[PDB]
Amino acid sequence: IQRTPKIQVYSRHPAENGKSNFLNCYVSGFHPSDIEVDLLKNGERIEKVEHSDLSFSKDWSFYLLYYTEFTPTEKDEYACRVNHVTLSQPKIVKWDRDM
């Protein structure tokens, strides 16, 4: 009855430096439903993250979208930090603007 979450970190629109965008952290295929999700800017936690209401797929597994508005630059780094019963330690997925 246990499923480790799948993690995707991307932007709503294609990243153009100096332009307003959205940074998303999509988390899916996980069970049970208790999960901790943080967006990170340069290693530190972002305050203004909202998220979608918990839903699930046909296989009963869960998914959630976290997201905050932001303006990407050439230098600024981003990530998503997820913890869950199935993870021994928090997993950090850096934002790679090629995936």
């Binding site: 499923r3 995707q8 709503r12 629109h13 439903s33 208790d34 979608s52 918990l54 839903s55 699930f56």
Partner: protein, 274 residues
């Protein structure tokens, strides 16, 4: 075309951290339109689509009341299941439910749904005849005795054949502009050198609705089914979806690969290349 309406219920127990939590989301096809979370201080049903907002206060209060009663009911179901199975109250437990209706282009009903999962496994489901139940195990058979005694099937049936269909038809009318639309994916390919010997070709599809889509990598006419890496389709946060497929190809041989995209917003499949 063919449309569906669906509600998703989730109750999760949280021992020594409150009473079990209860959330509901509503969907028309791939479009979220309504939500409820029992943790919100004065829990209320809230709109999540422009076209459900016109619905009046009688609607929103009725819906809220439904949601509130379910919160209590699910808490009680969790308790009853825990007792059936002889499970500890120290353990976390989940009960889910999907229900709704599917229709075709005429507005005709093709299938009604109503099934539960306990701890992420099928527990009991209403069969397609909307009359019988399929129970997973002996605990669920207890539940079935309860649902039969309370003639739950027939009342469900009535809902799924009348009201559910009428609500979906209405929503489709009110938000027809955006619900009947097919947003074709915007496409492109990216290249990422791995080693001296190989690289990654990624084919991209963005801004499409609805979510159903097919990305394939060919060379130069045959599909690399076994060698194509797919990501789960993901929401962009703006009602649209995103997805990519990647192939590992040898350095120098990029030219013989094509990417192909199929989507209902595309009259003809798209071909792309590096």
């Amino acid at each position: 075309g063919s449309h569906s309406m669906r509600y998703f219920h989730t109750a999760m127990s949280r021992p020594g951290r409150g009473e079990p939590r209860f959330i509901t989301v509503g969907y028309v096809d791939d479009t979220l339109f309504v939500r409820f979370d029992s943790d919100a201080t004065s829990p209320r049903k809230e709109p999540r689509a422009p076209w459900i907002e016109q619905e009046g206060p009688e609607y929103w209060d009725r819906e809220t009341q439904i949601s509130k009663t379910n919160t209590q009911t699910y808490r009680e179901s969790l308790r009853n299941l825990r007792g059936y199975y002889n499970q500890s109250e120290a353990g976390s437990h989940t009960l889910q439910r999907m229900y709704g209706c599917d229709v075709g282009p005429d507005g005709r009903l093709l299938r009604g749904h109503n099934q539960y999962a306990y701890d992420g496994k099928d527990y009991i489901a209403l069969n397609e005849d909307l009359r019988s139940w399929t129970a997973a195990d002996t605990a669920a058979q207890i539940s079935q005795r309860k649902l039969e005694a309370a003639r739950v099937a027939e009342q469900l049936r009535a809902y799924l054949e009348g009201e559910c269909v009428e609500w979906l038809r209405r929503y489709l009318e009110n938000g027809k502009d955006k619900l009947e639309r097919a947003d074709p994916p915007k496409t492109h390919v990216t290249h990422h050198p791995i080693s001296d010997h190989e690289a990654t070709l990624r084919c991209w599809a963005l801004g499409f609705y609805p979510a159903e889509i097919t990305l394939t990598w060919q060379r130069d006419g045959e599909d690399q089914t076994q060698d194509t890496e797919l990501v789960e389709t993901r929401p962009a946060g703006d009602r649209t979806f995103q997805k990519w497929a990647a192939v590992v190809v040898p350095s120098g041989e990029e030219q013989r690969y094509t990417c192909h995209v199929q989507h209902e917003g595309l009259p003809k499949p798209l071909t792309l290349r590096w």
